[PDB]
Design a protein around this ligand. Structure first.
Ligand SMILES: NC(=O)c1ccc[n+]([C@@H]2O[C@H](COP(=O)([O-])OP(=O)(O)OC[C@H]3O[C@@H](n4cnc5c(N)ncnc54)[C@H](O)[C@@H]3O)[C@@H](O)[C@H]2O)c1
Ligand SMILES: NC(=O)c1ccc[n+]([C@@H]2O[C@H](COP(=O)([O-])OP(=O)(O)OC[C@H]3O[C@@H](n4cnc5c(N)ncnc54)[C@H](O)[C@@H]3O)[C@@H](O)[C@H]2O)c1
Lengths: 395, 401
């Protein structure tokens, strides 16, 4: 084997107008730790300033100087799609691949077979479903992610989109923008959240933060999860437990999807399960696009079974220009941005460095960061995932 | 002058462009039993509508027609409200009762009030009476009433939604998705987490306190000011930081929310001079009244980067002219004035409007919490929350739309 590694890092493009020389504000708020006690990332040092854009090609997650100083090769590219890409060419001899879920470099079974030297697939972000976990397990490849880095960010985004759907924000803003007023056109589809029932599939780090933020809105809170929360937490929040997600759906005005993507959860929202939803239900999905059958959502919107769908995640990513969720009525869509706010980037850039430092010094990666290690699901992977391949259709 | 039958003049907004809906997205509304703090829900003798129907538009008539005509009253409903010859101003000369909503307000200026020979009651179906010249009402012995707390919770939700939308850069990001882009860096170059930020509210009244309660779990620092300080127990539970004046509060805040009524004390309180007090890249959410903010001062602060965003549903005048600068500015989260008129809110203020009318026509006193002006002075909620004066100056620009 060898002591020097090729690190291949896939990042999204700089803004169309160029890498920013200024930002809207002087500083970021200080965050001391995560809810529940997990500490913030602890790299030995960082080479960036918090609040800077780190996730684009010019930002490089602040890793270049550290990696090159240790004699490694560091390759950064945004060109990820196809057999022809810079990514797939560099992939053959890469020891480490880094990408973000917002601009994911899909490690399919085929691509992993081509990556002869691959020892570590690192997600700068949360969720590894763009990596085929079964292949990684079989190859002894480590899969790691920076757990909890943007969980709270996404929770804010969920509550924002819930309110946006129920109150009919996006169509109302269009009227204001176009020179209209059109009150009746706006509120013909507009309700208060107060008194509604909201269910969450998975109360994990995001799901629980969502339930906490919804509590003062005086809604009824329902959830299901692979792992039940402690009674103290359920009593505090007035949570109503359900054994299965299908038992939960008919109770809910709003359903929010907070669960990772793996064979148990893939296309869990489909023509059949949508029949369990109340007429005029809302779905917010900030977890993974492929949790929902794309055309089933569209059909449910057109038939009135759903009063709205919003989320920032699509499949595949980037979404094709003709992807149907872009144009459907009653949509609150954004590109996949919620986990990559400037506040979040500072955290996953630091965590990325921490994981790499541990990896190259032969120290153990934090168990909470692990998805796959030593030929098995480990750490957060053992807790939140199941073995299998979720990358089908990413081409 | 005195008789048992009244002419009620009711100004409502137009039906949807495609026509009045006979069906809705959902089967019924959530049950709401009372308001936080104990004020009971409206108590009309009966209601002639189903909760969830569109009541605030001209075909909806606030569900009042059958009740009014059965008692021999004349009920005129119109959306034509702006200008000297509008249906509204012609019918106004002999009206005993005027009803309008803040979303499509029939401005009762001194001039209009002077022309209204029979006007005994100015009824706001909704909250905030600043579209009525209160000094003229006071002088004429006209009663001014509104349906207090009817949509306060609806607006607080709208506020949190817009704070999150501004801070996280929702509107521009959605634009990229709709136009076929992806463009992550363009979205998030302006995108921050709310967590850890400082949020101040001007006024913790029914809306302000509901906003503070909804913001608490987002782990922000909460600041506020008001004419009346909250009880120590409430400050303690929410970790609120009190300021005596709104100008002492601004320099601390990443985000400022305006929850205060419009009257001479608050008019244009956000202007070039007070904006110098804000942190760079501050956000303002204003769901209270458009005229709280000098409109061009807001535009200048957005263009200079003093503000990183401005959002709200309220404009001055209303409807906003097509060339109103807040329509085209960057970093805005604007909607037309809809937050207090969701289908859930309409059910409550329609019932409240009916309750006030029934009281008025039976000679029973209107609930104190509903009163703004009664018997020649600020009374009830009016005494608590308003100051005397005339806020309707410049409202004639609405006729432009
Ligand atoms: N929109 C974004 O930018 C963004 C950022 C983070 C996560 N996401 C996604 O959201 C997911 C959740 O994030 P998280 O931080 O809360 O992770 P988490 O591991 O803390 O929470 C996941 C929860 O899902 C539960 N789970 C797994 N399989 C389940 C099943 N079959 N049925 C019910 N529950 C199941 C787990 O028990 C766990 O509680 C992530 O895996 C990631 O894919 C999106
Ligand atoms: N966008 C909408 O649809 C909508 C619906 C309701 C009201 N608004 C507006 O919001 C305002 C507030 O509504 P509310 O239900 O909270 O009413 P509220 O009367 O309960 O609260 C008003 C608060 O403002 C305070 N106040 C009055 N003058 C003040 C001053 N000079 N400085 C500081 N505080 C002052 C009062 O003490 C009171 O606490 C209304 O007057 C109305 O104009 C908007």
């Amino acid at each position: 084997m060898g002591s020097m590694a090729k690190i291949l890092c896939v990042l999204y493009d700089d803004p169309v107008d160029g890498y920013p020389k200024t930002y809207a504000r002087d500083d970021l708020p200080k965050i001391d730790h995560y809810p529940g006690g997990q500490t913030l990332p602890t790299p030995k040092a960082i080479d960036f300033t918090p609040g800077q854009l780190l996730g684009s090609v010019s930002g490089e997650l602040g890793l270049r100087k550290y990696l090159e100083a240790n004699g490694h090769t560091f390759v950064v590219t945004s060109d990820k799609d196809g057999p022809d890409s810079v990514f797939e060419k560099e992939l053959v001899d890469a020891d480490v691949v880094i990408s973000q879920p917002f601009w994911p470099a899909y490690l399919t079974p085929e691509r992993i077979a081509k990556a002869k030297n691959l020892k570590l697939a690192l997600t700068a972000g949360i969720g590894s479903d763009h990596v085929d976990l079964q292949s990684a397990i079989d190859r002894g490849i480590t899969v790691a992610e920076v757990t909890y880095c943007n969980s709270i960010s996404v929770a804010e985004h969920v509550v924002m989109m819930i309110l946006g759907l129920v109150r009919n924000y996006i169509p109302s803003h269009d009227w204001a923008r176009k020179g209209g007023w059109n009150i009746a056109d706006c509120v013909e589809h507009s309700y208060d959240l107060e008194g509604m029932t909201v269910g969450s599939v998975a109360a994990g780090r995001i799901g629980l933060a969502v339930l906490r933020r919804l509590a003062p809105f005086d809604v009824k809170l329902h959830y299901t999860d692979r792992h039940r929360l402690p009674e103290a937490v359920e009593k505090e929040l007035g949570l109503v437990w359900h054994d299965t997600r299908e038992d939960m759906y008919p109770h809910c005005d709003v359903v929010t999807l907070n669960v990772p993507l793996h064979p148990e959860t893939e296309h869990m929202i489909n023509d059949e399960t949508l029949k369990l939803f109340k007429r005029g239900a809302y779905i917010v999905n900030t977890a993974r696009g492929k949790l929902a059958d794309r055309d089933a959502i569209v059909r449910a919107i057109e038939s009135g079974q759903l009063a709205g769908y919003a989320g920032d995640v699509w499949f595949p990513q980037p979404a094709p220009k003709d992807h149907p969720w872009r144009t459907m009525k009653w949509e609150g869509m954004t590109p996949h941005i919620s986990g990559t706010s400037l506040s979040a980037q500072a955290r996953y850039a630091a965590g990325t460095r921490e994981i790499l430092e541990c990896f190259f010094e032969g120290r153990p990666i934090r168990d909470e960061y692990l998805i796959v290690q030593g030929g098995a699901l480990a750490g957060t992977g053992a807790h939140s995932y199941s073995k299998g391949n979720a990358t089908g259709g990413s081409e």
